[PDB]
Design a protein around this nucleic acid. Structure first.
Ligand SMILES: [Zn+2]
Ligand SMILES: [Zn+2]
Ligand SMILES: [Zn+2]
Lengths: 378, 454, 523, 116
RNA sequence: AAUAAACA
């Protein structure tokens, strides 16, 4: 058993510390005016001082192509992790497993901090707020819990009679939307736990929900090939649009924080950009996932780039304006990637398999050789 | 809730610098600019307070200058200024006689949301370059939209070449210059079509490229003549080499290239960090171990380029030329050290200007020594409260005893100006506080005069 | 014109000066006073008109000795090249310009070349000295690992055709205000890889002096050794104590007494003082240490946001400033040893540094940005657009032309009884200000500013209204005294027209624009 | 030093008035919360506070001699029904479990108490 | 006390 009561030896820990990078940028940005003023991080291991976080190099977003492996983070009960979030302080990392546990993993140095028995069902959804206040979760059972920053259990309520698969949140603490496997998107009142409205007319089980950061748009994705992507209108309840995008089973749908770009993972080996103000045409598609693309996460301080999971555990990195992918791990993260979550500083990325593990991914260090088993197996 | 902003000190510190015909065609005049302020300095040589930069006109803008180029238009008696302001505003201005102000010639607002392709957060600054023959001028709006201003009213209507809809899929521009020679405004454009980071060079070895697009002004097409495609991954600014040699030098961080259309590539390496990072054929520059990442440069009439490095070290690169006007080898010399610059200008031949934010941006003077090594001397220095990182209010220590019982606080500020080799404290004190050495009490008198008697 | 006329014109120039309280002259030309030629403009707000060989026109006020009636250049045997003037009370004063400044810059300045990056400065009030953190560049040689037992340091073994990385070694100087040389035997040099993140002047409570507070110089500093080594830090509280000087070196009476220097549990990023408590920022925590005889005893902390890089505070209200996330206001009670979160910003904001806009009863939170902005937040619990006291709200928006790191308050020179000018020095060499006003005097000028924005030929065709917009709603409430300064530049015929077009006379506006110039004539 | 020149000790700001009588703090939703990040209500120490259970700020009780070990990392499920203290005084910590039971400790910077 | 030590 594991209860913190038996003694273990003293150990130094694998540290990915952003503090020597963030301090460096503060010293920089005084005498830096742009990125065209920045001193170059020459490729050698001696230039470990000159790293700035990705806010320092807004230009050149290939900074945050996090292919350097850090740490497999596995539990002692070996359940496959589904959702992964960082605390918006960048302090820890709550992670959802099939037995309904929230293992809070550390941030600068990763250890473990506590276990929870949160859900009676496999966890399926996890989002924080725009302030750090409230965390939203959801599961296979239909129960949605509110969580604080100290992970207090708040009043829980059966939001759905069948398995929720997402929950995203309005630009406030007032409104959010959960889609489930009954096929509906139900938009919720935050405080009253009151069922505002049901967005029917969808056809089959909808497994993702997004909310547009300003305009109040609920975007969804579907297994139903007839009604795959629906925009919605949260105050009225009417179907605003319908976008026929994918041949089967749209997995995860994410909008930028700039408010224009729709991004859509799907089981036909594709990620697609849609400008949401022009649904007639189509922006670029993203080809390179040799099996199905099951997880997608936009980069926080770089609009333009995102990481894109695979059902073969393939972990790929893209960029808007760039047709083929940038980073690459194949046969490397083993299993089926369910979710990704960047650190708030966009410098270290997480993962999560259908195998029982959940690896962590920092940026490539200067002047190392990528002979690692993820990058070049030689 | 309400406030008034008032600006107590105009911003000292020059981000842009040129040498144009601002007041008339007879004399050139050093037009330098900073954040939201333009300055035009003349040149004294017989000054009492010897050479000295004399200010001639200074101008305040309601907007930060993001680039600045100049071109003498058709039949004009002065040299216009192509300013560039944030979110893609061009503004062609001129000095006017009569009213001693400016005079706007043209206003070009390019802040259209379809010119961004959705990218809200503008990261690229709009960059203004001119064709040295004065045929056209090109602004790189938002990184992806070459706005061309044709020249001959003295103007023609502009147009927006899409960058990403060219050949070669340019997609990450680093620098762009108008090259010399030619019959049409050829514009070299460095880019990175498959972008990498110094720190990730084992799967992405060297991805920088060049397209010398040739602008047809009338027909409004653009042939992408001449492309190279495996330049080192970390190339900083490109630079157009003038007419009698032609071509381009392309500063990389750890190397330095000389590229041309009919000549094979020739480029040397400046340290042994080019070993596992570059597949481009690099020789070994003997007796030199430096880097070129933030290094401003200008050209001596032909075959001599003044590189001021990071660290403020001036190198005068000599391009050694064959009899067929081709570059054979390079030749460095460690010339003197000077200001941590942000710009560079050749003035009247034998004078250089080092425009700098962080440091007193000063006027130099190179001479020939008794191949052709140049020795530098500082003639004048424009005073420059630099990037004030922190600043604290202090009390001065020589307040005279007559002013002592004054009710207001009497204080100054000490300012952490500059950076690095030009770092400083600056003692800023707005009013003037005299030293009373002798006082008198003479009532009844109301005026006073002083004369001189032997 | 052919008949023989002057081939010159005259251009009027902007000012800051008003002449508002035999033939007496107010314009007295002086040649060769401290090397300078020019004009002393007498009167109720006396000014100097200095033009050197630079050719630029310099307007330096002289607000000491009150108004000045007359003036004369004076050159004597015992007096150097100086001047000579009447007080208003009939006091003849032989006087000399102080000889250390240079009056050729827009403000009088003396440049003190340190030849190393000055990060901070802190005027220690007791014993009257400055304490500067510096940094020089040493070529690096070791790469710290952390392999499981202790730090191991890999020596950089490369080719002879190799340039080295830069290691910066930090030292805290001690600059003396009397003559501006540094003080020998007073230079706290730090460890090998330790970087100063803050120096301030911190007042901690004590039972020695007749007051409570003492006025130390506290500096926070942490070790940068790359992202693989855990960055740890160390609070360096100092003290400048006058000892007897060495015979021959009278500057050396000043010397540090390091009270506290102990390694903390994480990087020290920001420092503040609150009623004699030391408020320090370690990691994602902000600590509240109290200074005992030799040890710091912890009293309060809160698990804050990512990287708190600026904190200033007054009257137990701590205003933090993260790099990405949010500013926070905090609050420390004494009777319960607790620091707590009162209101934070909820939106992401890439702060540079923060301040305190002070009104007669309102406290505004002036917060500069990455995007060259200023903005004033307030804590308004009765407002319904925030949550109930759990979200700050911006109440003014402005777009400075330049980045801003420095911030300070002053009393300005009944109205203006309790309002503070919260000045700043921008990161491009300029020094601004934000003078608060009332609702009536603002809107008599916003009618003017909108009349000044449209009906004037601005330089380079620029729009001053859209330039001073927020650059993300832009809830602007801050005027532009560099556009309103053009009203002082218009002719008095043109002045009266824009007064009638907004519904007033020029004399009401000239009583409004010259009273925002009079109360802001410090330094 | 900011307190010689621009002193504000004589000002009663609206900010200090906003935090004494708390100026309209809403009775917090979801009565199984924690009241975390909140300081104290002076309405409870002097007299009756007014609202019970669903109140914003913290209500303290006596006879708490040991500070809470979970609370330091930022995980307090109990809140004000906690049987342990929530200050930062480094004298009321528990005995370290591995120094009291299992001989010596392991780490070098153990905060917890080591008694013999 | 509710996982402080969750180790390779
Ligand atoms: Zn209460
Ligand atoms: Zn507790
Ligand atoms: Zn112990």
């Amino acid at each position: 058993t594991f209860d913190g009561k038996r003694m273990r030896k003293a150990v130094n820990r694998k540290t990915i510390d952003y503090n020597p990078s963030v301090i460096k940028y503060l010293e920089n940005r005084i005498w830096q005016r742009d990125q065209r003023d920045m001193r170059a991080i020459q490729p050698d291991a001696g230039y470990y001082n000159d790293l700035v976080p990705p806010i320092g190099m807004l230009n050149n977003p290939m900074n945050a192509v996090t292919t350097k492996f850090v740490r497999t983070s596995t539990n002692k009960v070996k359940c496959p992790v589904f959702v992964v979030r960082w605390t918006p302080e960048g302090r820890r990392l709550v992670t959802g497993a099939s037995s309904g546990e929230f293992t809070l993993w550390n941030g600068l140095t990763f250890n473990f901090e506590t276990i929870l028995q949160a859900h009676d069902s496999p966890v399926r959804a996890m989002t924080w707020s725009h302030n750090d206040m409230w965390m939203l979760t959801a599961d296979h059972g239909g129960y949605v819990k509110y969580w604080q920053s100290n992970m207090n259990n708040v009043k829980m309520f059966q939001a759905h009679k069948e398995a929720i698969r997402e929950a995203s949140f309005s630009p406030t603490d007032n409104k959010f939307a959960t889609c489930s496997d009954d096929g509906t998107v139900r938009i919720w009142d935050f405080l009253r736990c009151h069922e505002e409205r049901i967005l029917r007319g969808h056809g089959a089980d909808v497994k993702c929900v997004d909310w547009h950061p300003t305009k109040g748009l609920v975007v969804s994705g579907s297994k139903d090939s007839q009604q795959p992507i629906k925009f919605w209108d949260p105050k009225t309840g009417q179907s605003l649009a319908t976008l026929h995008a994918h041949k089967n089973t749209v997995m995860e749908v994410k909008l930028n924080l700039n408010g224009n770009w729709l991004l859509t993972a799907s089981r036909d080996h594709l990620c697609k950009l849609f400008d949401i103000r022009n649904l007639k045409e189509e922006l670029q598609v993203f080809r390179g996932h040799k099996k199905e693309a099951t997880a997608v996460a936009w980069h926080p301080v770089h609009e333009g780039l995102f990481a894109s999971g695979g059902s073969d555990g393939s972990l790929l990195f893209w960029h808007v304006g760039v047709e083929k992918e940038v980073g690459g791990m194949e046969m490397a993260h083993e299993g089926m990637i369910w979710s990704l979550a960047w650190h708030p500083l966009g410098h270290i990325l997480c993962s999560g398999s259908n195998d029982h593990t959940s690896k962590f991914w920092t940026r490539n260090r200067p002047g190392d050789k990528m002979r690692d088993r993820y990058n070049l197996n030689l | 809730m309400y406030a008034v902003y008032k600006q107590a000190h105009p911003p000292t510190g020059l981000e842009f610098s040129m040498y144009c015909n601002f007041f008339n065609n007879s004399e050139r005049n050093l037009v330098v600019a900073g954040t939201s302020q333009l300055y035009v300095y003349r040149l004294n040589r017989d000054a009492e307070a010897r050479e000295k930069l004399e200010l001639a006109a200074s101008f305040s803008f309601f907007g930060n200058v993001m680039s600045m180029a100049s071109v003498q238009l058709a039949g004009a008696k002065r040299d216009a200024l192509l300013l560039s302001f944030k979110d893609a505003k061009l503004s062609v201005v001129e000095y006017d006689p009569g009213t001693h102000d400016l005079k706007t010639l043209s206003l070009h607002y390019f802040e259209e949301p379809e010119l961004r392709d959705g990218f809200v957060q503008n990261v690229h600054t709009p960059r203004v370059r001119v064709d040295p023959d004065g045929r056209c001028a090109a602004m790189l709006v938002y990184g992806t939209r070459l706005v061309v201003l044709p020249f001959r009213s003295s103007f023609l209507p502009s147009y927006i070449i899409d960058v990403r809809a060219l050949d070669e899929k340019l997609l990450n521009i680093i620098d762009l210059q108008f090259l010399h020679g030619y019959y049409e405004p050829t514009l070299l454009i460095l880019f990175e079509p498959n972008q990498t980071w110094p720190g990730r060079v084992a799967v992405r070895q060297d991805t920088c490229s060049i397209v010398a697009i040739s602008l047809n002004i009338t027909q409004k097409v653009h042939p992408v003549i001449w492309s190279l495609t495996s330049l080192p991954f970390d190339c900083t600014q490109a630079l157009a080499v003038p007419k009698p040699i032609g071509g381009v030098v392309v500063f990389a961080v750890n190397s330095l290239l000389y590229l041309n259309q009919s000549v094979p590539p020739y480029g040397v390496a400046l340290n042994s960090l080019t070993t596992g990072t570059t597949a481009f054929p690099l020789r070994t520059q003997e007796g030199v171990r430096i880097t070129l990442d933030c290094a401003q440069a200008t050209f001596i009439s032909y075959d001599k380029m003044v590189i001021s490095l990071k660290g403020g070290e001036i190198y005068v690169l000599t391009l050694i030329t064959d009899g067929m006007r081709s570059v054979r080898a390079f030749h460095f010399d460690k010339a003197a050290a000077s200001v941590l610059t942000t710009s560079m200008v050749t003035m009247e031949p034998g004078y250089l200007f080092l425009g700098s934010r962080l440091g007193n941006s000063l006027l130099l003077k190179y001479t020939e020594k008794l191949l052709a090594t140049y020795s530098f001397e500082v003639c004048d220095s424009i005073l420059n409260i630099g990037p004030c990182a922190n600043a604290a209010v202090g009390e001065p220590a020589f307040l005279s005893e007559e002013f002592q019982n004054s009710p207001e606080p009497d204080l100054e500020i000490v300012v952490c100006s500059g950076h690095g080799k030009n770092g400083a404290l600056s003692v800023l004190q707005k009013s003037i506080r005299p030293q009373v050495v002798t006082t008198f009490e003479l009532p009844g008198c109301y005026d006073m005069w002083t004369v001189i008697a032997p | 014109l052919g008949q023989g006329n002057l081939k010159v014109r005259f251009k009027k120039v902007p000012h800051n000066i008003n002449f508002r309280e035999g033939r007496v002259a107010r314009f007295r030309y002086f040649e060769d006073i401290y090397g300078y030629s020019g004009v002393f403009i007498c009167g109720p707000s006396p000014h100097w008109l200095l033009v050197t060989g630079r050719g630029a026109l310099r307007l330096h006020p002289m607000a000491i000795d009150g108004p000045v009636d007359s003036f004369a250049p004076f050159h004597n045997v015992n007096c150097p090249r100086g001047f000579l003037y009447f007080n208003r009370q009939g006091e003849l004063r032989i006087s000399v310009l102080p000889a250390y400044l240079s009056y050729d810059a827009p403000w009088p300045v003396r440049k003190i070349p340190l030849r190393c990056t000055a990060h901070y400065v802190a005027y220690h009030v007791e014993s009257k000295v400055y304490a500067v953190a510096t940094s020089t560049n040493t070529p690096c040689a070791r790469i710290p690992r952390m392999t499981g037992e202790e730090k191991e340091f890999e020596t950089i073994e490369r080719d002879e055709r190799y340039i080295h990385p830069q290691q910066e070694a930090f030292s805290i100087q001690l600059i003396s205000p009397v003559s501006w040389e540094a003080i020998p035997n007073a230079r706290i040099e730090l460890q090998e890889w330790e970087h100063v993140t803050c120096m301030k002047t911190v007042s901690l409570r004590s039972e020695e002096t007749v007051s409570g507070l003492k006025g130390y110089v506290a500096a926070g500093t942490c070790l940068m050794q790359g992202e693989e080594v855990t960055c740890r830090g160390r609070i360096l509280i100092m003290d400048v104590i006058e000892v007897v000087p060495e015979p021959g070196q009278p500057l050396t009476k000043n010397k540090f007494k390091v009270l506290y220097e102990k390694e903390q549990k994480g990087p020290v990023t920001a420092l503040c003082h609150c009623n004699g408590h030391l408020v320090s920022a370690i990691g994602q925590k902000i600590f509240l240490w109290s200074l005992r005889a030799s040890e710091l005893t912890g009293m309060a902390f809160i698990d804050t946001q990512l990287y708190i890089h600026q904190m200033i505070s007054v009257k137990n209200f701590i205003l933090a400033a993260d790099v990405m996330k949010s500013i926070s206001l905090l609050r420390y009670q004494e009777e319960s040893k607790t620091l707590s979160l009162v209101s934070r910003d909820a939106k992401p904001l890439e702060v540079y540094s923060v301040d305190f806009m002070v009104d007669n009863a309102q406290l505004g939170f002036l917060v500069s940005d990455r995007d060259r902005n200023l903005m004033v937040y307030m804590y308004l619990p009765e407002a319904k657009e925030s949550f109930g006291g759990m979200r700050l709200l911006r109440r003014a928006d402005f777009h400075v032309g330049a980045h801003v790191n420095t911030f300070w308050r002053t009393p300005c020179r009944v109205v203006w009884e309790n309002k503070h000018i919260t000045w700043f020095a921008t990161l491009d060499g300029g020094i601004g200000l934000l003078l608060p006003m009332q609702e009536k005097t603002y809107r008599r000028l916003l009618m003017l500013q909108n009349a000044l924005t449209t009906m004037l030929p601005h330089h380079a065709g620029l729009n001053p209204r859209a330039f001073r917009m927020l650059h993300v709603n832009a809830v602007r409430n801050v005027l532009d005294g560099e556009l309103l300064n053009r009203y002082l530049y218009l002719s008095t015929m043109e002045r009266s027209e824009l007064a009638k077009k907004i519904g007033t006379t020029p004399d009401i506006i000239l009583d409004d624009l010259l009273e925002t110039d009079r109360v802001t004539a410090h330094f | 030093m900011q307190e010689i020149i621009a002193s504000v000790d004589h000002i009663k700001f609206d900010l200090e008035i906003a935090v004494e009588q708390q100026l309209g703090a809403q009775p917090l939703p979801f009565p199984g919360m924690d009241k975390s990040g909140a300081a104290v209500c002076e309405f409870f120490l002097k007299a009756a506070c007014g609202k019970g259970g669903m109140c914003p700020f913290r209500h303290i009780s006596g006879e708490k001699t040991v500070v809470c070990k979970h609370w330091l990392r930022g995980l307090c499920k109990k809140g004000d029904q906690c049987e342990f203290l929530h200050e930062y005084d480094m004298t009321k910590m528990p005995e370290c479990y591995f120094y009291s039971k299992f001989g010596e400790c392991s780490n070098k910077e153990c905060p917890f108490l080591h008694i013999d």
